[model samples]
Target: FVNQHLCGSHLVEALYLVCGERGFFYTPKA
Candidate 1:
């Protein structure tokens, strides 16, 4: 829900970059 809000409505499936305050994205759900 919160992620969806941040990500907006562009994505409807998976692969969401739910990075934290200092989290980085390199692979997988990046």
Candidate 2:
């Protein structure tokens, strides 16, 4: 479960970076 969570986090970070490159903003949900 820990490894899976880390992988998911990495994927999210990558997606966030790509979105940022495209000038799209993202914010975490409360």
Candidate 3:
């Protein structure tokens, strides 16, 4: 599960970058 956890973290990091580019300080999921 560690590998998946790491990937999930990276995905969130990437998501943050994309959101920032779109002028979003935060995006609520769910």
Candidate 4:
């Protein structure tokens, strides 16, 4: 379960970076 959570976080981080490159600056909700 912890690993799954980490995987999700990593995906979100990747998405955040991609959006950042495109000029977005928002955080994900829990």
Candidate 5:
């Protein structure tokens, strides 16, 4: 469960970075 959570954390972080690159912000799934 921890690893799955970490994977999701990493994915969410990546998504945030993507959203930031375009000068935007969003709430990713948790």
Candidate 6:
């Protein structure tokens, strides 16, 4: 479960970086 969560989180981070290149910012909740 932790591994899966990390994978998903990594993908989310990648997407955020891509979107950020186009001026998008994602503030994820803890």
Query: Against the true structure, whose lDDT is highest?
Result: 6
Candidate 6 lDDT over 1-30, as tens digits, reads: 224554456867766766776755446655
Q: All candidates' lDDT scores?
A: 0.41, 0.56, 0.55, 0.57, 0.56, 0.59
Q: Write the per-residue lDDT of candidate 4 for residues 1-30, one digit (tens) a residue.
A: 224454456766755766776765445565
Cα RMSD for candidates in order: 7.2, 5.9, 6.1, 6.1, 6.3, 6.1
Question: How does each model score on TM-score?
Answer: 0.16, 0.40, 0.39, 0.40, 0.39, 0.40
**Model 5 per-residue lDDT at 10:** 76
Task: Write candidate 3's Cα lDDT for 1-30 as tens digits.
Answer: 224543455767766776676753434464
Q: Which pairs clash (backbone N, Cα, C closer than 3 Å) in model 3?
A: none
Residues 1-30, model 2: lDDT tens digits: 224443446756766766776764345563
Using lDDT as the yardstick, the better of models 2 and 3 is 2
Q: Model 2 segments beyond 4 Å from truth? A: 1-6, 21-30
Better of 1 and 6 by TM-score: 6
lDDT of 1 by residue, 1-30 (tens): 445443434332223445545554443364
Which of the predicted structures, 1 or 6, would earn the higher lDDT when compared with the native? 6
Candidate 3: C-alpha RMSD to true structure equals 6.1
Clashes in candidate 2: how many?
0
Regions of candidate 4 where Cα sits further than 4 Å from its true position: 1-6, 21-30
Kindly provide the TM-score of model 3 when superposed on the true structure, using C-alpha atoms. 0.39
Error of 6 at 1 (Å): 22
Q: Give the TM-score of candidate 6.
A: 0.40
Point out the higher-scoring one by TM-score: 1 or 4: 4
